[PDB]
């Protein structure tokens, strides 16, 4: 087999292939995750360089791993499918042997472990992908939002963004998200997520996708018109 | 220069630079001394600490009841090779009810090190070993280099400043070879030999490591207040 | 050892691009233009052959349009040999699915499979990627008519109309200008040929330089029929649409 | 011995060129002229027996090879590469086809199988491409008479008539003028001998020319492939 | 250029420079010789005494293969040992199948093909040893010498290492002055002399002489080391000839 | 799993004051057919050990080669191959014992019973048994197969326990062995008159005696 | 058919006192009605103040005792000459014996 | 390019030396061994205020008698921890006892040099392995990616390490109490941390014979930080 | 310029390593020649023993592959022996599998197909040798077939190999231009050997002693090499007419 060590240390103590994978994430369309009191919302950018698309069949940016956990990402799209497949398989394998669905932390830890494996295995490059993994643990009403990245590190976030101009939307969320009082309702949480995207998206509701995840496997993706109502309400308040 | 990228490449003067660089790792390692009489064989090792909070890196490893070595250089490689010796010693005992000859032990170490120097991908071992033992032909001392070269000697030293201890032994040769049936006097000569390779630092209680094997003496290591007797 | 001669086909550039994928796309940009257009009552595949001599036997020739099963076809842009490797893999996946579930493979599942293979060559193995971009024209009873494309990166996307190969920038503007959602197959046939007629690097568009195909449910008793157009039929449709 | 060349030696350059395929084609260009012409009732393939020494017995070196009873092959470029392709082509015509279906493969499929082997040398680890272009002439019951070209890339095209190697540009122009869709096999052989005379410097006779036909059955069937004798060629050279 | 950076690469000359660099390591090593006599062979080697701490007679260089073949080499000593280990495996597999002990020409090609194999790939280094070996078989005595390239030939006398030219000159005198042949006991004495004469090229450090021999009359066709009185008799003969 | 085809019968042995004696008849039976009358079943290893082997003859011949090969291998890079680092009976035995048990544990045994008789470096008598199952034991008298039933009773009257070994001379021990071989010839249907005997003494070394015969044969009571 | 097992007889006896223990065994080794040896030791000192016997099929017994003795040696190497406690020895022996669960050591072991 | 297991001309493995540079870039981790216990403490170093800092797990349980703190590319440690845990439990399965801290450390370190062309590169993370056993008492070890491990009375690794080590040099004596060591880790962390030390960006832990390995609550550490501030203001 | 280090195409469509293996062919500085009689095939080759310490009996570049097939090598001896051992192995395996003696040309093509593989696969170098196979084939009669580092192979009426091959080739070409036949019209192999030696003397412009030549002869059902004394007899006959 092809054994060649592609991810290796450089004289200054950096693994360039892992760092160059982060640059592929930087290029990817923006993704955002905001957890409320009783929900998590995953917002995702859709670049409008591609029109004449068929939105019914084009791969959606948020993926279900199980009925209670979702995964969105920024970076290489083809690479994301490999992590999503592996996670979905592990989700069923966990149910099969533990008789209980994965916790969001567990599912995250697995995906992050796969990303890590590719940074010190021969013949393979790291995943050009960072993920936001969100959902609710079984029989638990506390929201969960995790982030992973090519190096294999993962951690828990009150809110987070990844991808292109994530610096700007992280700036926004850092000032607008209060930990002592998070978005109490679904409305507030979705609003704050759309607002944060509108800092970067700079265009209509076709370029914003929203998915709301609630406890007890209650996942729903918002339509264009539902999102467009938030876009209308945000800018009408802004004119003041 | 251009011919030091891997072990598989000869230089234009017939040199293997990776092997020579591995040899260099030994010289950077701490000093250890080996010497023997007709009855006993002694290892003396100056252990090295990282700082004053740290322990002193163990230099001497036991391979069988009648054989063991001291190391200088990459300690993990000494672990790999010592473990390999332990297995060969063990295989001899189990299959042939026979203690492994010290000369044959050296031959096995040589050939294991050699394979790493002729094949692509790997690397030479980055450690030098002094193997002492007492077998069916009396006391023995060996010097192992990771080039593959193993050498039977009356006495020697390897590591940093080891030339001073090596000259001392070269002078003392006729004295210490005659220290038969007296372990303490042979250890004294080994402690006096390793002293010639010291600068600034001197032999303290948790600094010095001594081992001995002989006629009616199993391979036993002495550390701590056990070696205070010889300071 | 061998490391000296390794191109390292599966690495990132400092910018975060996959060198070989980018250069394979550059290869594909020079290949003959292929166009897929999806109508409400069928899909059109049109593609331009390249170099072509008068001595090329056209009726027994297939460099662009291939059949994967009775429901799904592909238009190729890039190395024909590389495409045929992937095609025979796709043809098998379709039959494996049929054998397992006793139902024809859904178009997106087949496409994902091929695209996952292409992805694998960009992340591991140390081999060059496949210098091929596909347009998948297909029908299933979940999503009806579907157009997709995949490229050497292993990324795939769905389309109403799309081009691959040469002059895609020019082709995609002309399609974006004249396409409409209520369009019909006969109109899409005309749009496809008009687009190629303008984007072609040849002096004129003739029957001998074209491969053409339609996937119609337009058959008796609501069943999907693939029609790979014969040389004489491409010549008729060129006269019908008024290009020659 | 580890075959450590598990990585491609043919890769895409920045311009989109596959260097080694292009260079393999350059090798084919330097090779001796061979050609193929398709008649209504047959196909002809021909090439020059470029004798490396006059002491060498050029009868032993067969440039024109039988692949199946109804399929023949000729080449331009590197002879040793051609030889091993003829070996594999003959074998694959038995293993993957005759031993399964109880009949020989049709021309197009055997061509496709050869093309596959040449493609794999263009992408597999630790190999250069084949330095030959093949001209495969053949007949089968449902497709009739056919002539194909196969390049180092693995690409193949069907031809009415064509030429490859040294004087291919000039030879193809010559064929374009002479070819029509009402040629009889004898007319095609006549044209082949004319076309081949242009590219040949030295001696031009049945001993320095190799020429075979796919035609009528020579007495389950008889074989349609027939290699013309040194005498048979010379006879037609008097009516030239 | 760059043709010398990888093993198994033909330079534009037609040469494999990595093999020729292995030869430099051989030329750097101590002197070793072989002398074919009437009914056998004699091997001898220069062992440089680096220090007084080296135990005399202990660091043996000449190696036995099977019970009838002697091997000695100059250059990288571990590479020599690796080649002898393989030779022992070859000689063992031959005897296992064919019953008879391996013939010397047969054994010579077994080493030859193996050393040659290490010039066929860039993933291995060539052998850094010229190996002089031989013994007595059913067809009589045979002396061989095997280079890093895989080249070997039969010899009347052989020599390699740093003192090879000095030795070769001496071997050439013996071949001329004894056409009817040299006896086994004569060859031991001459071997001692030739190592002593070839020590002028390594004259800085003093050395230790080591001799072995196979002879149909003197050792029953088996490889034995020259020890004790016969060794001292040869050293005395050698010491007398230099003075 | 096999079955033994050509077979050798009893190997008998005993310790005496200075060394060990071992003996075995020169027959290779082929079932009831007394096929091969010139089979040596005592195989010396160096000048301090004799391995006596009963059971399958092809497997004996395999073991014979393993021992021949062991001598060769011990000589390699061993300047003391004829002195301090020569093969010992205990080494030779342990090797064979390892082999026999390994082979039984792979369900493919060497179909033999072996007695290794010899004298060690320090002058100690070595006498130990091993068989196709890897079962090992030592005793002042050892015998395989048939001899275990007839030879041991006779030989144990000379050396019944360890304390009798220093009291037994080589003449007494050799007589006892030759007597036992006679008793076996009368009563073992798969034995022969012709045998080999080997004495390994700590002073006089290895004495190997070939072409011996059972004599002094009492048949005269038959005529009645 | 080849039977890999045999019975070499013998009998062993362990008794635990308050500050001591004994392990005894007869020194007779047999097969069927024949005596092989009247003195073939069966109870072994294995080091670390542990005595062991594996009575039954003497080959499997010797094998096991040898393997455990070696396990003691490698426990010293791998854990800084630490004394193998009798409870630890016992668990180590369980894994040695269960290792051949489907081709058992045909012995009743006592330490 | 060049081999992964190549020696430099000084007699060092390049990749090992470069991984040591990665470990210098890591967050600070400090260990202090005493006769009452071994204390492990880490800098959490949250990259943003939105990151929920209790999810930064840089101190980890291997067994009840062995804890572990990490510094460097912390993702690399997961497989090392996994191995350590499996090793500890497996040894208890084979021998019905706790595994010695040195033996555990040695087992972890045996992975370290299993790299070449096995894994493709060394680990980019150093470990402080703290524990207790009956033979050698309370122990602190430093496990590098070179495969070497040193025992330490006290040790700092990561970005603040040479500064912290010099501080540990002066402060450590053989008569330190556990409470003293806790404050001393907090003191030295606060010195070498960029951000101001509190209960949410620093974590303490310890391993005692009685209670085993315990990661400290944020409430418990908060009281020790308040105890530290007052005792530093006290002179 | 790594296209010159391994067996891949240069921009010109060339394999430089193959070309440099062809140059290694003449490194021995030996010329070989092969001719065919009626009943036989004779191969002669220069023998050079520069060292007096060499056992001249072991200095040989002619090999007995099978009983019917002989092989002379132009190139370095280690690669010659590599090729010899493989050809022997192939010829033995052939006889086992197919129940008749491997024909000369079938072996040549086999060794050629192996040589081709080293020109396409990168990890294997070509052998720096040209292999001239000779036999009296039971179907084709007297046979000469030659293989090179490229993997090319072809049958010959006669051939010559080495540094001065062109001189020997043209000398032979001119003789066959006169006789107008593909062989030496001679009953005894002894006289075909005399022809071979004579035409090498004329072509190279050097006289030979018995120890300067090495001769191989193929007849029906055996190939054999001539001793020094057999060659001396051959040289005497040449001189005497
Ligand atoms: Cl072949």
Short mmCIF file of C-alpha atoms in Angstrom, two decimals, chain D residues 1-5, chain E residues 6 121-124:
data_model
loop_
_atom_site.label_atom_id
_atom_site.label_comp_id
_atom_site.label_asym_id
_atom_site.label_seq_id
_atom_site.Cartn_x
_atom_site.Cartn_y
_atom_site.Cartn_z
CA UNK D 1 12.99 -5.67 -2.40
CA UNK D 2 9.87 -3.71 -1.61
CA UNK D 3 8.03 -2.41 -4.69
CA UNK D 4 7.77 0.98 -2.98
CA UNK D 5 6.38 2.67 -6.09
CA UNK E 6 20.39 5.93 -5.62
CA UNK E 121 16.68 -2.07 -6.24
CA UNK E 122 16.98 1.41 -4.66
CA UNK E 123 15.35 0.14 -1.43
CA UNK E 124 18.52 -1.79 -0.46
#
